[PDB]
Amino acid sequence: STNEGMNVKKCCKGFCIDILKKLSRTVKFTYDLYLVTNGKHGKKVNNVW
Amino acid sequence: GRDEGCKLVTIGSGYIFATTGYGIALQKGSPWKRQIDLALLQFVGDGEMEELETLWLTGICHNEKNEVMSSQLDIDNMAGVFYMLAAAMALSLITFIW
Amino acid sequence: SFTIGKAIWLLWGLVFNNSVPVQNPKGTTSKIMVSVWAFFAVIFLASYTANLAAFMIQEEFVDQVTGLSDKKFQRPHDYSPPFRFGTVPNGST
Amino acid sequence: NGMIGEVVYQRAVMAVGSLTINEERSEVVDFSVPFVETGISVMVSRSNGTVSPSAFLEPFSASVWVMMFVMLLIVSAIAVFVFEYFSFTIGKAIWLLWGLVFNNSVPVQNPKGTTSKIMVSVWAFFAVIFLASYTANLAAFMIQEEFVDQVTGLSDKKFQRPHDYSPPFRFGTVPNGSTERNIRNNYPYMHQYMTRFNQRGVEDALVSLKTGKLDAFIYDAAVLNYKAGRDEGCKLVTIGSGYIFATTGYGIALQKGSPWKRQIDLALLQFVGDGEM
Amino acid sequence: KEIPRSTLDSFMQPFQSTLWLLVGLSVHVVAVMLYLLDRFSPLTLSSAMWFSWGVLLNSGIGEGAPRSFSARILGMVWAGFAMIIVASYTANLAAFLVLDRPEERITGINDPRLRNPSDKFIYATVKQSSVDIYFRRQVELSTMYRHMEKHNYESAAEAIQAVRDNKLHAFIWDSAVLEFEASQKCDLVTTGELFFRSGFGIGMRKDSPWKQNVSLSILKSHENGFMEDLDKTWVRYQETLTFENMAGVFMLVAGGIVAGIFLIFIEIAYK
Ligand SMILES: *[C@@H]1O[C@H](CO)[C@@H](O)[C@H](O)[C@H]1NC(C)=O
Ligand SMILES: *[C@@H]1O[C@H](CO)[C@@H](O)[C@H](O)[C@H]1NC(C)=O
Ligand SMILES: *[C@@H]1O[C@H](CO)[C@@H](O)[C@H](O)[C@H]1NC(C)=O
Numbered sequence A: 001s002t003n004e005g006m007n008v009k010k011c012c013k014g015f016c017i018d019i020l021k022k023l024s025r026t027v028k029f030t031y032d033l034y035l036v037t038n039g040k041h042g043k044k045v046n047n048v049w
Numbered sequence B: 001g002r003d004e005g006c007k008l009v010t011i012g013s014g015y016i017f018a019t020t021g022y023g024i025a026l027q028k029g030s031p032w033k034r035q036i037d038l039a040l041l042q043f044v045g046d047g048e049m050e051e052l053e054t055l056w057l058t059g060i061c062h063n064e065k066n067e068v069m070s071s072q073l074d075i076d077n078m079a080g081v082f083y084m085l086a087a088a089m090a091l092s093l094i095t096f097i098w
Numbered sequence C: 001s002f003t004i005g006k007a008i009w010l011l012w013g014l015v016f017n018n019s020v021p022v023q024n025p026k027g028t029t030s031k032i033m034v035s036v037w038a039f040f041a042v043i044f045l046a047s048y049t050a051n052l053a054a055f056m057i058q059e060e061f062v063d064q065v066t067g068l069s070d071k072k073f074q075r076p077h078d079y080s081p082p083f084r085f086g087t088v089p090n091g092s093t
Numbered sequence D: 001n002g003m004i005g006e007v008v009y010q011r012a013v014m015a016v017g018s019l020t021i022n023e024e025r026s027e028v029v030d031f032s033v034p035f036v037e038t039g040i041s042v043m044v045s046r047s048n049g050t051v052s053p054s055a056f057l058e059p060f061s062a063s064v065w066v067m068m069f070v071m072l073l074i075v076s077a078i079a080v081f082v083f084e085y086f087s088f089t090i091g092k093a094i095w096l097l098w099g100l101v102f103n104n105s106v107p108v109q110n111p112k113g114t115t116s117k118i119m120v121s122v123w124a125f126f127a128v129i130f131l132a133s134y135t136a137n138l139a140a141f142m143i144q145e146e147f148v149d150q151v152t153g154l155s156d157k158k159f160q161r162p163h164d165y166s167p168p169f170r171f172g173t174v175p176n177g178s179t180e181r182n183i184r185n186n187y188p189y190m191h192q193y194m195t196r197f198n199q200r201g202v203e204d205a206l207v208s209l210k211t212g213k214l215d216a217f218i219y220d221a222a223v224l225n226y227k228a229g230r231d232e233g234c235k236l237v238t239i240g241s242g243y244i245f246a247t248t249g250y251g252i253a254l255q256k257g258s259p260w261k262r263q264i265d266l267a268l269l270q271f272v273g274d275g276e277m
Numbered sequence E: 001k002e003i004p005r006s007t008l009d010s011f012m013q014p015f016q017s018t019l020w021l022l023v024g025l026s027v028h029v030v031a032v033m034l035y036l037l038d039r040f041s042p043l044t045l046s047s048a049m050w051f052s053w054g055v056l057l058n059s060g061i062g063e064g065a066p067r068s069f070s071a072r073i074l075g076m077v078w079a080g081f082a083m084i085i086v087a088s089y090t091a092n093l094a095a096f097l098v099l100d101r102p103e104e105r106i107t108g109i110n111d112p113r114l115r116n117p118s119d120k121f122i123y124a125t126v127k128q129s130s131v132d133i134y135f136r137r138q139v140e141l142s143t144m145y146r147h148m149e150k151h152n153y154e155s156a157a158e159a160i161q162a163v164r165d166n167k168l169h170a171f172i173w174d175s176a177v178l179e180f181e182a183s184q185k186c187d188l189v190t191t192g193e194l195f196f197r198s199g200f201g202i203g204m205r206k207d208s209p210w211k212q213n214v215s216l217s218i219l220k221s222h223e224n225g226f227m228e229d230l231d232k233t234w235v236r237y238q239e240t241l242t243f244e245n246m247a248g249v250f251m252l253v254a255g256g257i258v259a260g261i262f263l264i265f266i267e268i269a270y271k
Helices: A015-026 B033-044 B048-056 B076-097 C007-013 C028-057 D002-008 D023-028 D064-085 D093-099 D115-140 D178-184 D188-197 D202-210 D221-228 D261-272 E019-039 E044-057 E071-098 E130-137 E142-148 E156-164 E175-184 E213-223 E226-235 E247-270
Strands: D040-044 D216-220
Touching (some): A015 B033, A015 B048, D040 D221, D064 D093, D115 E044, D115 E247, D202 D216, D216 D221, E019 E071, E044 E071, E130 E142, E175 E226
Antiparallel strands (some): D040 D216
């Protein structure tokens, strides 16, 4: 019923995590990693992604 | 590859499908396109991507194992021998009428 | 004394040697030809059993559906079990 | 002489390459920690051979044959019971029942009372599945394949004298090598029968093994493992895995009292302690 | 990797129930139609049944031959039928008991089901071992560290009894000790891939007069075969049968013998 929540810190490993870490080794950018809370990958629901 | 028992197997190797890939989506107008593309080609160009694929892809269930799946039974073989048997019944009828 | 046309039944019952009591061949040449035929049948049996064993060893695997354009992908009433397949919701697929 | 002469007379600091470990080197110099498990081994002719089907005890094990004799006695007793009703199947019932296992006996008289026919049917189905199991055991005999070593190890009775056994053979090592001192400190007669059977080059010794100019050869284990891992012809699966052999390692020789020794030992244990070795 | 194979050989009853009923109904229909063909000729029923069982049976029996002007064609078809059945059955039973060998093992440390573990593959080690330090140093082994730290044991014999009771599914340990346990307990088999080839020596103090001569004495023990003698004392010193398969076959054979004897009592009581 409400839209208030918390930002839980969670660990991330895997293939794309290694891709991101090696790109940070090469391109030298600091990642700002978080998860999606809107939902799934993406779909244009009535001209709204 | 992590299928316990090697039961669930895909159809071949993806022949009759969309045949696409994965990439990194950026905003329309980002200046980081070319450097990230050259870095991805560098990761392809040295096998470091292949090292990560070796690390992060299981490969135990190989393609078309010759395991215990032969259940000591065929149905079609004695079915065709029964078709030959029905032909033998027909030839017996032909030799019996004359 | 009756192995004129009955020799075919004798021969293709002794291709397999399935205990077919036929006759006593008093002719020596007939016994020699039966011996050669029996040795031929033994090596043919060994070759056929080896062929069956190697065909078990050469183990291929057919598939139920080998295409996205399959006729099974038109209607599951086309065959007697109606098979089932879905996708993920709200997905690109 | 060689690297030992260079280190002892101090025209060099250390030797990096492949180097055995024995008493006289530890007398004159100091080894490092060993980094690789490298003993010695023997490369022999080791031809194809056969699969050796000497004896089989899997289907019957000299005790199903008891069941054969028991059911022969049972069939003979019921043949006497058939003869009570009604014809030489009293003592001939054994030859009748066990001659039809291999389905080529002379056709003996059989009664019309169906009793002998039923028990011949049961015994015959048992013989059919027994021959099926026998052919299956012969088919599963193909699964294992190993030609055994003619020489078990360095303590072989062949190594006492090649004239003691019917084929004479031959074996060598390297001239002016450490294996000479490794053998002569333990087996002088080995060297006395080996001295006529010397050679020059390790690959030359391999060619002499392939072309039949040499029967056996004694060298380091991992070097012959590498030679088996590069062999053309693939007729070389060596004697065991270093069971009855010197079983040493490779080290780095330093001066007696060099300050580098502890650091080199820690560096080698770091190189093993991360999988980089 | 110790699970018995072919405990009953799947002859008729562990196999699916077609072939006995199929061959029985087949020989029944064949015997009926050949006896009816013998009636319409262009102990006769007993002779036809005996001929059917003998052609289906392939051993050798002193039987006669009925009037078979067209029945010998059906008999030779039945003969080829019977031999292709028994040949197919012998061939696929043999070829099934050849290829009855899965991969039940792990094949070394490079197992992604152990890199990405689960609640099934329970692998652990001795609590506070140097194996734990060796896996704690390396950068990509912390997941196996997290898996093993839940179920580490105090001594190795505890793990031996646990995997003997199948409470463990894998156990990282030194090679020759597990080879010795394989020699002791035959229900314990190691894996093939050898990783981290290490050395076992003597724990020593700092700079001491026993630093040099003890190493010299170990080298003296290696130059002779005294270590080989110690291997002979402890390392080398190790420790279709048709009796689980064809035992019930023989029991059904003896039951058929008794039932056939009783049926022959009934037959002599009638005839
Ligand atoms: C999928 O899309 C619909 C569109 O209304 C949305 O309501 C739903 O929450 C989404 N989630 C599912 C079921 O995948
Ligand atoms: C070993 O070295 C000596 C040095 O004089 C040499 O003459 C000889 O040919 C070499 N071969 C042997 C005996 O190993
Ligand atoms: C070690 O061995 C040497 C002989 O090689 C001997 O003189 C010495 O007493 C031994 N121990 C010491 C005190 O170094």
